Each structure stands twice: as C-alpha cells, then as structure tokens.
Amino acid sequence: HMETFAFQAEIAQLMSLIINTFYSNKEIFLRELISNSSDALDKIRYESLTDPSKLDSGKELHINLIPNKQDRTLTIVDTGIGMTKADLINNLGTIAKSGTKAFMEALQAGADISMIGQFGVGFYSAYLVAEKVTVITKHNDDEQYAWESSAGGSFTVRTDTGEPMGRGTKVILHLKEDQTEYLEERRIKEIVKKHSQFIGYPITLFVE
Ligand SMILES: Nc1ncc(Cl)c(C(=O)N[C@@H]2c3ccccc3-c3c(-c4nc5cnccc5[nH]4)cccc32)n1
C-alpha cells in the first residue's frame, strides 16, 4: 500500500544542497527538529484551549529523543498536532517550495545553512546527518501514516501498521555511517543544552 511521489524541483535541489555541500556544523539538525516538535505541541495545546476533546488522543505534551546504536537511528518523538495525509503530500509540499525558494535566495546572498529554520524548512536539516528519514505521524483528523525519503527525487507515503501512537510525530533519522556521534548520550545532552535549553516541554533523552 506504498504510494511514491516526486519532489518538485526546488525542494529536490535543496535536498541535494544539504547532502552535497561541505558544512561541518551538522549538529543544528537537532535544534531544528526539536523546534518543529515544540511548534506542533504549541499548536495542539492552543487548539485544546477551545476544544478540550482535542487531547482525548493523549494529554501529555512532550518530546523524547531515542538513540538506537544497533539500528543506527536517532528518533525525535513528540505528542504534538501530527500531520494528516493531505499535510504530508500537499500542504507541506507548498511550504517546502516557498521556504526553499526564500532560503536559496538568502544563501546566494550570504546566509548560512544554520539559518534554515527561519525559512520553515528546518526539517530538511535532517539530511545533514541522515541517509533516510522516516516520519510516522498521527493527527486527530486522520489515520497513522509513514512518510519516507532517501532523497533521489522521490518520497513515499503509506498507512502505518506499526505501534499505534495516539497523536504526534516520530522523525526517525537513519544516520549516515560517519554520523554515529549523534547516538552518544554525552553528545546529545551537549547539543540540547547548547540549542534547546528553553523549550517549553519536557525533553527526555533516552539512553541504552
Ligand atoms: N514534529 C513535527 N510535527 C509537525 C510537523 Cl508539520 C513537522 C515537520 O517538520 N514536518 C515536515 C515539513 C516541514 C516543512 C516542509 C515540509 C515538511 C514535511 C514533509 C513534506 N515535505 C514535502 C515536500 N514536497 C512534497 C510533500 C512534502 N511533505 C513530510 C513530512 C514531514 C515534513 N514536524
């Protein structure tokens, strides 16, 4: 039941830029994914102020960071708003295109790759460290889906039959072979303290 989609040219070019450009400050991917999780948590929390039933799918608002050395993955889990199928295929494609255009204009002018989140496409900083990204997500208005891409111009979307999430998003980073430092407890703790110390939700760094 896996559907395959083509990225539009602008976001495909940004993915190639992120993968190919020499840029040593890769650690900022984690700040960007935590910021996305914080934004998604703010969104469901604000909606719950008008409709408390929005939290029937889970009252806890949190972010978990889960390293797995055997699988070579780093997972960022949140209980935020999640994404519907229409967000995954259509709405976020619209954001990816306009944000990429603005970011590329800013880069040619002299901006740095670390400013990617100002353009609403900080998610794509995952490709600084991951060869493949898998997004498992559950929004209140839709079913659980898995979006995935290893770049190369395409992504896939399928209904996910994995462990039911309640609500939120898991960003699974299948790390590149030379980026295993992001599985180490001391490294993750250092990065969260440097860039994400004031996020308004509990961030639990899991260990093995
Ligand atoms: N924790 C959490 N909770 C909610 C969201 Cl909304 C996100 C997030 O960062 N979503 C990402 C995002 C951002 C910007 C542009 C595209 C995308 C995107 C996409 C996406 N990029 C696309 C590019 N072209 C077509 C369809 C696309 N769909 C897919 C999955 C996840 C994200 N993260």
Side-chain angles (χ1 to χ4, degrees), residues 14-95:
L14 180 57
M15 292 177 82
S16 286
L17 185 153
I18 292 168
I19 292 163
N20 303 331
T21 305
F22 183 74
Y23 183 72
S24 300
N25 184 39
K26 295 179 178 284
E27 71 187 26
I28 66 94
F29 80 90
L30 187 59
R31 166 195 73 199
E32 300 304 328
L33 299 177
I34 289 171
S35 177
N36 293 344
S37 287
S38 180
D39 292 350
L41 286 158
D42 287 346
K43 194 168 178 177
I44 193 60
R45 182 182 59 191
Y46 203 78
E47 289 188 359
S48 79
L49 300 179
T50 55
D51 183 0
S53 75
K54 294 258 170 179
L55 300 175
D56 287 356
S57 51
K59 285 190 186 79
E60 291 76 20
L61 301 179
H62 58 70
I63 300 168
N64 297 329
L65 309 180
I66 309 181
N68 190 289
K69 282 186 176 168
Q70 179 63 53
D71 294 344
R72 208 205 294 153
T73 58
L74 177 63
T75 305
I76 297 69
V77 181
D78 69 68
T79 53
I81 195 154
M83 287 161 279
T84 64
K85 188 188 178 180
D87 288 326
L88 290 172
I89 294 164
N90 306 109
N91 312 146
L92 294 163
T94 303
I95 299 305

Coordinates of all heavy atoms in Angstrom, one line a residue, residues 14-95:
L14 N 17.2 21.7 -3.0 CA 17.6 22.0 -1.6 C 18.1 20.7 -0.9 O 19.1 20.7 -0.2 CB 16.5 22.6 -0.8 CG 16.8 22.9 0.7 CD1 18.0 23.8 0.8 CD2 15.6 23.4 1.4
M15 N 17.5 19.5 -1.2 CA 17.9 18.3 -0.6 C 19.3 18.0 -1.1 O 20.2 17.6 -0.3 CB 16.9 17.2 -0.9 CG 15.6 17.3 -0.2 SD 14.4 16.1 -0.6 CE 14.9 14.8 0.5
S16 N 19.6 18.2 -2.4 CA 20.9 17.9 -2.9 C 21.9 18.9 -2.3 O 23.0 18.5 -2.0 CB 20.9 18.1 -4.4 OG 20.2 16.9 -4.9
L17 N 21.5 20.2 -2.1 CA 22.4 21.1 -1.5 C 22.8 20.7 -0.1 O 24.0 20.7 0.3 CB 21.8 22.5 -1.5 CG 22.7 23.7 -0.9 CD1 22.2 25.0 -1.5 CD2 22.6 23.8 0.6
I18 N 21.8 20.2 0.7 CA 22.1 19.8 2.1 C 22.9 18.6 2.1 O 23.9 18.5 3.0 CB 20.7 19.7 2.8 CG1 20.0 21.0 3.0 CG2 20.9 19.0 4.2 CD1 18.6 20.9 3.4
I19 N 22.7 17.7 1.2 CA 23.5 16.4 1.2 C 24.9 16.7 0.6 O 25.9 16.0 1.1 CB 22.7 15.4 0.4 CG1 21.5 14.9 1.1 CG2 23.6 14.1 0.0 CD1 20.4 14.2 0.3
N20 N 25.1 17.5 -0.3 CA 26.4 17.7 -1.0 C 27.3 18.8 -0.5 O 28.5 18.7 -0.8 CB 26.2 17.8 -2.6 CG 25.4 16.7 -3.2 OD1 25.4 15.6 -2.8 ND2 24.7 17.1 -4.3
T21 N 26.7 19.9 0.0 CA 27.6 21.0 0.5 C 28.5 20.6 1.6 O 28.0 20.0 2.6 CB 26.7 22.2 0.8 OG1 25.9 22.5 -0.3 CG2 27.6 23.5 1.1
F22 N 29.7 21.1 1.6 CA 30.6 20.9 2.7 C 30.2 21.9 3.8 O 30.2 23.1 3.6 CB 32.1 21.1 2.3 CG 33.0 20.8 3.4 CD1 33.3 19.5 3.8 CD2 33.6 21.8 4.2 CE1 34.1 19.2 4.9 CE2 34.4 21.6 5.3 CZ 34.7 20.3 5.6
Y23 N 29.8 21.4 5.0 CA 29.3 22.2 6.1 C 29.5 21.4 7.3 O 28.8 20.5 7.6 CB 27.9 22.6 5.8 CG 27.3 23.5 6.9 CD1 27.8 24.9 6.9 CD2 26.5 23.1 7.9 CE1 27.3 25.7 7.9 CE2 26.0 23.9 8.9 CZ 26.5 25.2 8.9 OH 26.0 26.1 9.9
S24 N 30.5 21.8 8.2 CA 30.8 20.9 9.3 C 29.8 21.0 10.5 O 29.8 20.1 11.3 CB 32.2 21.2 9.8 OG 33.1 21.0 8.8
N25 N 29.1 22.1 10.6 CA 28.2 22.4 11.8 C 26.8 21.7 11.6 O 25.8 22.3 11.7 CB 28.0 23.9 11.9 CG 27.2 24.4 13.1 OD1 27.3 23.8 14.2 ND2 26.4 25.4 12.8
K26 N 26.9 20.3 11.5 CA 25.8 19.5 11.3 C 24.8 19.4 12.5 O 23.7 19.1 12.3 CB 26.2 18.1 10.9 CG 26.9 18.0 9.5 CD 27.3 16.6 9.2 CE 28.0 16.4 7.9 NZ 27.0 16.4 6.7
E27 N 25.4 19.6 13.7 CA 24.6 19.4 15.0 C 23.3 20.2 15.0 O 22.4 19.8 15.8 CB 25.4 19.7 16.2 CG 25.7 21.2 16.4 CD 26.7 21.5 17.6 OE1 27.5 20.6 17.9 OE2 26.6 22.6 18.1
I28 N 23.2 21.3 14.3 CA 22.0 22.1 14.3 C 20.7 21.3 13.8 O 19.6 21.8 14.1 CB 22.1 23.4 13.5 CG1 22.3 23.2 12.0 CG2 23.3 24.3 14.2 CD1 21.0 23.3 11.1
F29 N 20.9 20.2 13.2 CA 19.7 19.5 12.8 C 18.8 19.2 14.0 O 17.6 19.2 13.9 CB 20.0 18.1 12.1 CG 20.4 17.0 13.1 CD1 19.4 16.2 13.6 CD2 21.7 16.9 13.6 CE1 19.8 15.2 14.6 CE2 22.0 15.9 14.5 CZ 21.1 15.1 15.0
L30 N 19.4 18.9 15.2 CA 18.6 18.5 16.4 C 17.8 19.7 16.9 O 16.6 19.5 17.2 CB 19.5 17.9 17.4 CG 18.8 17.3 18.6 CD1 17.8 16.2 18.1 CD2 19.7 16.8 19.6
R31 N 18.4 20.9 16.9 CA 17.6 22.1 17.3 C 16.5 22.3 16.4 O 15.4 22.6 16.8 CB 18.6 23.3 17.3 CG 17.9 24.7 17.4 CD 18.8 25.8 17.0 NE 19.1 25.9 15.6 CZ 20.2 26.6 15.1 NH1 21.0 27.2 16.0 NH2 20.4 26.7 13.8
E32 N 16.6 22.0 15.1 CA 15.6 22.3 14.2 C 14.4 21.3 14.3 O 13.2 21.7 14.3 CB 16.1 22.2 12.7 CG 17.2 23.2 12.4 CD 16.8 24.7 12.6 OE1 15.6 25.0 12.5 OE2 17.7 25.4 13.0
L33 N 14.7 20.0 14.6 CA 13.6 19.0 14.8 C 12.9 19.2 16.1 O 11.7 19.1 16.2 CB 14.2 17.6 14.7 CG 14.8 17.3 13.3 CD1 15.4 15.9 13.3 CD2 13.8 17.5 12.2
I34 N 13.7 19.6 17.1 CA 13.1 19.9 18.4 C 12.2 21.2 18.3 O 11.1 21.2 18.9 CB 14.2 20.1 19.5 CG1 14.8 18.7 19.9 CG2 13.5 20.7 20.8 CD1 16.0 18.8 20.8
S35 N 12.6 22.2 17.5 CA 11.8 23.4 17.3 C 10.5 23.0 16.6 O 9.4 23.5 16.9 CB 12.6 24.4 16.5 OG 11.8 25.5 16.2
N36 N 10.6 22.1 15.6 CA 9.4 21.7 14.9 C 8.4 20.9 15.9 O 7.2 21.2 15.8 CB 9.8 20.7 13.7 CG 10.5 21.4 12.6 OD1 10.6 22.6 12.5 ND2 11.1 20.6 11.8
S37 N 9.0 20.1 16.8 CA 8.2 19.4 17.7 C 7.5 20.4 18.7 O 6.3 20.3 18.9 CB 9.0 18.4 18.5 OG 9.4 17.3 17.7
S38 N 8.3 21.4 19.1 CA 7.7 22.4 20.0 C 6.6 23.2 19.3 O 5.6 23.4 20.0 CB 8.9 23.4 20.4 OG 8.4 24.4 21.2
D39 N 6.8 23.5 18.1 CA 5.7 24.2 17.3 C 4.5 23.4 17.2 O 3.3 23.9 17.3 CB 6.2 24.6 16.0 CG 7.3 25.7 15.9 OD1 7.6 26.3 17.0 OD2 7.8 25.9 14.8
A40 N 4.6 22.1 17.0 CA 3.5 21.1 16.8 C 2.8 21.0 18.2 O 1.5 20.8 18.2 CB 4.0 19.8 16.3
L41 N 3.5 21.0 19.3 CA 3.0 20.9 20.6 C 2.2 22.2 21.0 O 1.1 22.1 21.5 CB 4.1 20.6 21.6 CG 4.6 19.1 21.6 CD1 6.0 19.0 22.1 CD2 3.7 18.2 22.3
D42 N 2.8 23.3 20.6 CA 2.1 24.6 20.8 C 0.8 24.6 20.1 O -0.2 25.1 20.6 CB 2.9 25.8 20.3 CG 4.1 26.2 21.0 OD1 4.3 25.8 22.2 OD2 4.9 27.0 20.5
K43 N 0.7 24.0 18.8 CA -0.5 24.0 18.0 C -1.6 23.2 18.6 O -2.7 23.6 18.7 CB -0.2 23.6 16.6 CG -1.3 23.9 15.6 CD -0.7 23.7 14.2 CE -1.8 24.0 13.1 NZ -1.2 23.9 11.8
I44 N -1.3 21.9 19.1 CA -2.4 21.1 19.7 C -2.8 21.7 21.0 O -4.0 21.8 21.3 CB -1.9 19.6 19.7 CG1 -3.2 18.7 20.1 CG2 -0.8 19.4 20.7 CD1 -4.3 18.8 19.1
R45 N -1.8 22.2 21.8 CA -2.2 22.8 23.1 C -3.1 24.0 22.8 O -4.2 24.1 23.5 CB -0.9 23.3 23.8 CG -1.3 23.9 25.2 CD 0.0 24.4 25.9 NE 0.6 25.5 25.1 CZ 1.8 26.0 25.3 NH1 2.5 25.6 26.3 NH2 2.3 26.9 24.4
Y46 N -2.8 24.9 21.9 CA -3.7 26.1 21.7 C -5.1 25.6 21.2 O -6.1 26.1 21.7 CB -3.1 27.0 20.7 CG -3.6 28.4 20.8 CD1 -3.2 29.3 21.9 CD2 -4.7 28.9 20.1 CE1 -3.7 30.5 22.1 CE2 -5.3 30.1 20.3 CZ -4.8 31.0 21.2 OH -5.3 32.2 21.5
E47 N -5.2 24.6 20.3 CA -6.5 24.1 19.8 C -7.2 23.6 21.0 O -8.5 23.7 21.1 CB -6.3 23.0 18.8 CG -5.8 23.6 17.4 CD -5.9 22.5 16.3 OE1 -6.3 21.4 16.6 OE2 -5.5 22.9 15.2
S48 N -6.5 22.9 22.0 CA -7.2 22.3 23.1 C -7.9 23.3 24.1 O -8.7 23.0 24.9 CB -6.3 21.4 23.9 OG -5.4 22.1 24.7
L49 N -7.4 24.6 24.0 CA -8.0 25.6 24.8 C -9.4 25.9 24.4 O -10.2 26.3 25.3 CB -7.1 26.9 24.8 CG -5.7 26.8 25.2 CD1 -5.0 28.1 25.1 CD2 -5.5 26.2 26.7
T50 N -9.7 25.8 23.1 CA -11.1 26.0 22.6 C -11.9 24.7 22.7 O -13.1 24.7 23.0 CB -11.1 26.5 21.2 OG1 -10.3 25.6 20.4 CG2 -10.4 27.8 21.1
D51 N -11.2 23.6 22.3 CA -11.8 22.2 22.3 C -11.0 21.3 23.2 O -10.1 20.6 22.6 CB -12.0 21.7 20.9 CG -12.8 20.4 20.8 OD1 -13.1 19.8 21.9 OD2 -13.0 19.9 19.7
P52 N -11.3 21.1 24.5 CA -10.5 20.1 25.3 C -10.5 18.7 24.7 O -9.5 18.0 25.0 CB -11.2 20.2 26.7 CG -11.8 21.5 26.7 CD -12.3 21.7 25.3
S53 N -11.5 18.2 24.0 CA -11.6 16.9 23.4 C -10.4 16.6 22.4 O -10.1 15.5 22.1 CB -12.9 16.6 22.8 OG -13.1 17.2 21.5
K54 N -9.7 17.7 22.0 CA -8.5 17.5 21.1 C -7.4 16.7 21.8 O -6.6 16.2 21.1 CB -8.0 18.9 20.7 CG -8.9 19.8 19.9 CD -8.5 19.8 18.5 CE -9.5 20.4 17.5 NZ -9.0 20.4 16.2
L55 N -7.4 16.7 23.2 CA -6.5 15.9 23.9 C -7.0 14.5 24.3 O -6.3 13.8 25.1 CB -5.9 16.7 25.1 CG -5.2 18.0 24.8 CD1 -4.9 18.7 26.1 CD2 -4.0 17.8 23.9
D56 N -8.1 14.1 23.8 CA -8.6 12.7 24.1 C -7.6 11.7 23.6 O -7.5 10.6 24.1 CB -10.0 12.5 23.4 CG -11.2 13.2 24.1 OD1 -10.9 13.9 25.2 OD2 -12.3 13.2 23.6
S57 N -6.8 12.1 22.5 CA -5.8 11.2 21.9 C -4.5 11.2 22.7 O -3.5 10.6 22.3 CB -5.6 11.6 20.5 OG -5.3 13.0 20.5
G58 N -4.5 11.9 23.9 CA -3.3 11.9 24.8 C -3.1 13.3 25.4 O -3.0 14.3 24.6
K59 N -3.1 13.4 26.7 CA -3.0 14.7 27.4 C -1.5 15.1 27.5 O -1.3 16.3 27.6 CB -3.6 14.7 28.8 CG -5.1 14.7 28.7 CD -5.8 15.0 30.1 CE -7.3 14.9 30.0 NZ -7.8 13.5 30.0
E60 N -0.6 14.2 27.5 CA 0.8 14.6 27.7 C 1.4 15.3 26.5 O 1.2 14.8 25.4 CB 1.6 13.3 28.1 CG 1.3 12.7 29.4 CD 0.1 11.8 29.5 OE1 -0.5 11.4 28.5 OE2 -0.4 11.6 30.7
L61 N 2.1 16.4 26.8 CA 2.8 17.2 25.8 C 4.3 17.1 26.0 O 4.8 17.7 26.9 CB 2.2 18.6 25.8 CG 0.7 18.8 25.6 CD1 0.3 20.2 25.8 CD2 0.3 18.3 24.3
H62 N 5.0 16.3 25.2 CA 6.4 16.0 25.5 C 7.2 15.8 24.2 O 6.6 15.5 23.2 CB 6.6 14.9 26.5 CG 6.0 13.6 26.1 ND1 6.5 12.8 25.1 CD2 5.0 12.9 26.7 CE1 5.8 11.7 25.1 NE2 4.8 11.7 26.1
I63 N 8.5 15.7 24.4 CA 9.5 15.4 23.3 C 10.4 14.4 23.9 O 11.0 14.6 24.9 CB 10.3 16.7 22.9 CG1 9.3 17.8 22.4 CG2 11.4 16.3 21.8 CD1 9.9 19.2 22.2
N64 N 10.6 13.3 23.2 CA 11.6 12.2 23.6 C 12.6 12.1 22.5 O 12.3 12.1 21.3 CB 10.9 10.9 23.8 CG 9.9 10.9 24.9 OD1 10.0 11.6 25.9 ND2 8.8 10.0 24.8
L65 N 13.9 11.9 22.9 CA 15.0 11.7 22.0 C 15.5 10.3 22.2 O 15.9 10.0 23.3 CB 16.1 12.7 22.2 CG 15.7 14.2 22.3 CD1 16.9 15.1 22.5 CD2 15.0 14.6 20.9
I66 N 15.4 9.4 21.2 CA 15.6 8.0 21.3 C 16.7 7.5 20.4 O 16.5 7.3 19.2 CB 14.3 7.2 21.1 CG1 13.1 7.8 22.0 CG2 14.6 5.7 21.4 CD1 11.8 7.0 21.8
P67 N 17.9 7.2 21.0 CA 19.0 6.7 20.1 C 19.0 5.2 20.1 O 18.6 4.6 21.2 CB 20.3 7.2 20.9 CG 19.9 7.2 22.4 CD 18.4 7.5 22.4
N68 N 19.3 4.6 19.0 CA 19.4 3.1 19.0 C 20.7 2.8 18.1 O 20.7 2.9 16.9 CB 18.2 2.5 18.3 CG 18.2 1.1 18.5 OD1 18.9 0.3 17.9 ND2 17.4 0.6 19.5
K69 N 21.7 2.4 18.8 CA 23.0 2.0 18.2 C 22.9 0.8 17.3 O 23.6 0.9 16.2 CB 24.1 1.8 19.3 CG 24.6 3.2 19.9 CD 25.8 3.0 20.9 CE 26.3 4.4 21.3 NZ 27.3 4.3 22.4
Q70 N 22.2 -0.2 17.6 CA 22.0 -1.4 16.8 C 21.4 -1.1 15.4 O 21.9 -1.5 14.4 CB 21.1 -2.4 17.5 CG 20.9 -3.7 16.8 CD 22.1 -4.5 16.5 OE1 22.9 -4.9 17.4 NE2 22.3 -4.9 15.2
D71 N 20.3 -0.2 15.4 CA 19.6 0.2 14.2 C 20.3 1.4 13.6 O 19.9 1.7 12.5 CB 18.2 0.5 14.6 CG 17.3 -0.6 15.0 OD1 17.8 -1.8 14.8 OD2 16.2 -0.4 15.6
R72 N 21.2 2.1 14.3 CA 21.9 3.3 13.8 C 20.8 4.4 13.5 O 20.9 5.0 12.5 CB 22.8 3.1 12.6 CG 23.9 4.2 12.6 CD 24.5 4.5 11.3 NE 25.2 3.3 10.8 CZ 25.4 3.1 9.5 NH1 24.9 3.9 8.5 NH2 26.1 2.0 9.1
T73 N 19.9 4.6 14.4 CA 18.8 5.6 14.3 C 18.8 6.5 15.5 O 19.0 6.1 16.6 CB 17.4 4.9 14.2 OG1 17.2 4.1 15.3 CG2 17.3 4.1 12.8
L74 N 18.4 7.7 15.2 CA 18.0 8.7 16.3 C 16.6 9.1 16.0 O 16.3 9.6 14.9 CB 19.0 9.9 16.3 CG 18.6 11.0 17.3 CD1 18.7 10.4 18.8 CD2 19.6 12.2 17.2
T75 N 15.7 8.9 16.9 CA 14.3 9.2 16.8 C 13.9 10.4 17.6 O 14.1 10.4 18.8 CB 13.4 8.0 17.0 OG1 13.8 6.9 16.2 CG2 11.9 8.3 16.7
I76 N 13.2 11.4 17.0 CA 12.7 12.5 17.8 C 11.1 12.3 17.8 O 10.5 12.3 16.7 CB 13.0 13.9 17.1 CG1 14.5 14.2 17.0 CG2 12.3 15.0 17.8 CD1 15.4 13.3 16.1
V77 N 10.6 12.1 19.0 CA 9.2 11.8 19.2 C 8.5 13.0 19.8 O 9.0 13.5 20.9 CB 9.0 10.6 20.0 CG1 7.5 10.2 20.2 CG2 9.8 9.3 19.5
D78 N 7.4 13.4 19.4 CA 6.5 14.4 20.0 C 5.1 14.0 20.0 O 4.7 13.2 19.2 CB 6.7 15.8 19.5 CG 6.2 16.0 18.1 OD1 4.9 15.9 17.9 OD2 7.0 16.1 17.1
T79 N 4.3 14.5 21.0 CA 2.9 14.3 21.1 C 2.2 15.6 20.6 O 1.1 16.0 21.1 CB 2.5 13.9 22.5 OG1 3.0 14.8 23.4 CG2 3.0 12.5 22.8
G80 N 2.7 16.2 19.6 CA 2.2 17.5 19.0 C 1.0 17.2 18.1 O 0.4 16.1 18.2
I81 N 0.6 18.1 17.3 CA -0.6 18.0 16.4 C -0.5 16.9 15.4 O -1.6 16.4 15.0 CB -0.8 19.4 15.8 CG1 -2.3 19.4 15.2 CG2 0.3 19.8 14.7 CD1 -2.9 20.8 15.0
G82 N 0.7 16.5 15.0 CA 0.8 15.5 14.0 C 0.5 16.0 12.6 O 0.2 17.3 12.4
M83 N 0.5 15.2 11.6 CA 0.2 15.6 10.2 C -0.8 14.6 9.6 O -0.6 13.4 9.7 CB 1.6 15.5 9.4 CG 2.5 16.6 9.7 SD 4.2 16.3 9.2 CE 4.8 15.3 10.6
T84 N -1.7 15.2 8.8 CA -2.7 14.3 8.1 C -2.0 13.9 6.7 O -0.9 14.4 6.4 CB -3.9 15.2 7.7 OG1 -3.5 16.2 6.8 CG2 -4.6 15.8 8.9
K85 N -2.7 13.0 6.0 CA -2.2 12.6 4.7 C -2.1 13.8 3.8 O -1.1 14.0 3.0 CB -3.1 11.5 4.1 CG -2.6 10.9 2.8 CD -3.6 10.0 2.2 CE -3.1 9.4 0.9 NZ -4.0 8.5 0.2
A86 N -3.1 14.7 3.8 CA -3.1 15.9 3.0 C -1.9 16.9 3.4 O -1.3 17.5 2.5 CB -4.4 16.7 3.1
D87 N -1.5 16.9 4.7 CA -0.4 17.7 5.1 C 0.9 17.1 4.4 O 1.7 17.8 3.9 CB -0.2 17.7 6.6 CG -1.2 18.5 7.4 OD1 -1.7 19.5 6.8 OD2 -1.5 18.1 8.5
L88 N 1.0 15.7 4.6 CA 2.2 15.1 4.1 C 2.4 15.2 2.6 O 3.6 15.4 2.2 CB 2.1 13.6 4.5 CG 2.3 13.2 5.9 CD1 2.0 11.7 6.1 CD2 3.6 13.6 6.5
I89 N 1.3 15.1 1.8 CA 1.5 15.1 0.4 C 1.4 16.5 -0.2 O 2.2 16.9 -1.1 CB 0.5 14.1 -0.3 CG1 0.8 12.7 0.2 CG2 0.4 14.3 -1.8 CD1 -0.4 11.8 -0.1
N90 N 0.4 17.2 0.2 CA 0.1 18.5 -0.4 C 0.5 19.8 0.4 O 1.3 20.5 -0.1 CB -1.5 18.6 -0.6 CG -2.0 17.4 -1.4 OD1 -2.7 16.5 -0.9 ND2 -1.6 17.3 -2.7
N91 N 0.0 19.9 1.6 CA 0.2 21.2 2.3 C 1.6 21.5 2.6 O 2.1 22.6 2.4 CB -0.7 21.3 3.5 CG -2.2 20.9 3.3 OD1 -2.8 20.3 4.2 ND2 -2.7 21.2 2.2
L92 N 2.3 20.4 3.0 CA 3.7 20.6 3.3 C 4.6 20.7 2.1 O 5.7 21.3 2.1 CB 4.3 19.6 4.3 CG 3.6 19.7 5.7 CD1 3.8 18.4 6.5 CD2 4.3 20.9 6.5
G93 N 4.1 20.2 1.0 CA 4.8 20.4 -0.3 C 4.8 21.9 -0.7 O 5.8 22.5 -1.2
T94 N 3.6 22.6 -0.4 CA 3.5 24.0 -0.7 C 4.5 24.8 0.2 O 5.2 25.7 -0.3 CB 2.1 24.5 -0.5 OG1 1.2 23.7 -1.3 CG2 1.8 26.0 -0.7
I95 N 4.6 24.5 1.5 CA 5.5 25.1 2.4 C 7.0 24.8 1.9 O 7.8 25.7 2.0 CB 5.2 24.6 3.8 CG1 3.8 25.0 4.3 CG2 6.3 25.1 4.8 CD1 3.4 26.5 4.2

